[PDB]
Structure 1
């Protein structure tokens, strides 16, 4: 697309969120209570925002997408089919900072509500492939301690824990499918 779908949607004036931050660092106070909103029309739009790399659209997209799945309740399952093609583009940006942003969001998705991972298994051929790109590329420093663990920037470390979450809630069939995309994986 010529322009990221997120930016055009926001400037119009239909997103229900604003910054209005007065506190320790920053915060978001939704113009309307979360429960009322419809997830079908909004939930995939936010996920389009993860790709954005120019402020403030980066964070303002990020904070919600973490927030939407936290208080979803049970309606989230309806949107699972709608979240495939957007997120596929998100991992293809090849940008180091983004993958850190989206990977946590996807990992937290499986644990948000019950009986969702079993639905996500069939779509493994879409989200698994890029995950193989950088599995082995990791820092090799040695004895000198790493000062950077505070914020998760290690691509190899972030991903490795990612699959573990996927298979534990994936179900019985989860293991076989994961191997067929990325071979080096070892069962857990």
Structure 2
């Protein structure tokens, strides 16, 4: 798309979000509370916004999406099928921080509500191949300490953790599916 969907939907102005941050680092206040909010109209857009690369949209979309996932409740299950394309394309954007953020978002999605792993099981073909290529790549600094784990950009460790948490909830067929998609995966 020529212009980002979150861009043309934020200058749209119908977002209930406003940064207005007076806190430790940053925060966002909302003129609409989630129980009034309809997730069908908004969650695809928020997951779409993760692809955006220039400020303040990245922070806005990240915070909104994570808090929606946290306090959505059972409503996430219904909007699951629509979310597959944005999370696939954001992962395909091949940018390192974008993969890190969307990786964390997938983790919080899977752990957010129950009875969603089985529903996502048919959908590995969309989302795993991007992680397949970079599972191999990793840093080998040697003896020395790594001081950088304060923030999480180690793509290999993060994807391995996501595979672990994903399989812990997927079920019986999840293991064979993920092994089929990525060969080097190891049983847990």
Fold similarity call, TM over 0.5: yes
Paired with 1:156 and 1:107, the residues of 2 have a C-alpha distance of 15
Distance, in Å, in 2 between the alignment partners of 1:28 and 1:71 is: 15
Q: In 2, Cα distance between the equivalents of 1:129 and 1:119?
A: 19
Deviation at 1:97, TM superposition (A): 1.0
Q: Deviations over 1:14-37 (max 9, x none)?
A: 111000110111111111111111
For 1:107-148, what per-residue CA distance to the aligned partner results, in whole angstroms no more than 9, with x for missing partners? 111110110111000000000110101001000011010010
User: How many residues are treated as equivalent by the alignment?
Assistant: 188
Question: Equivalents in 2 of 1:77, 1:36: separation in Å?
Answer: 17
Q: Deviations over 1:140-184 (max 9, x none)?
A: 011010010110011111111010011000011110100111000
Runs of 4+ in 1 over 3 A off after TM superposition: none
CA distance in 2, matches of 1:136, 1:180: 16
> What 5-or-longer segments of structure 2 have no aligned partner?
none
Offset of 1:11 from its aligned partner? 0.4
Cα distance in structure 1, aligned partners of 2:12 and 2:4: 14
Instruction: Please give the secondary structure, in 1, of the residue aligned with 2:72.
Output: coil
Q: Distance in 2 between matches of 1:166 and 1:121?
A: 10
- 1:19 equivalenced with 2:19 (yes/no): yes
Q: Deviations over 1:23-68 (max 9, x none)?
A: 1111111111111111111010000000001001111011111100
Scaled by the length of structure 1, the TM-score of the pair is 0.98
TM-score normalised over the length of structure 2:
0.98
Segments of structure 1 that go 5 or more residues without pairing to the other structure are none
Pair 1:86-2:83 in alignment: no
